[PDB]
């Protein structure tokens, strides 16, 4: 299975938030390792991993994420245990306050790989 949560994003935030920053944010918040995978689970697009950082400087809307997109964020260092993967639903809401990017407080445990 997978952990699940909703990200509350303002519209202006999807349009300004850089992918590189989004990755750091999710990694640190839920304690993933350095090597990670970020996939659009909606349409199965590998958007970022520890080997494909080419869209680093693009914003979230520039890589075609939007309201209702589901992102799957995985642990790719995965020696023996891994940080459990999480599926995050992007809730782009009007009118959330400007520059809102609220990540859900979810429990993401270590599990056997």
Numbering used by the authors: 440 to 552
Provide the authors' own sentences about this structure as they appear in the paper.
Therefore, to obtain a more detailed understanding of Uba2's ufd interactions with Ubc9 and to obtain broad insights into how E1-E2 specificity is established in general, we performed structural analysis of the Uba2ufd-Ubc9 complex from S. cerevisiae.
The two V-like structures are adjacent to each other, and together form a W-shaped surface. The structure of the Uba2ufd is nearly identical in the complex as on its own (0.47 Å rmsd).
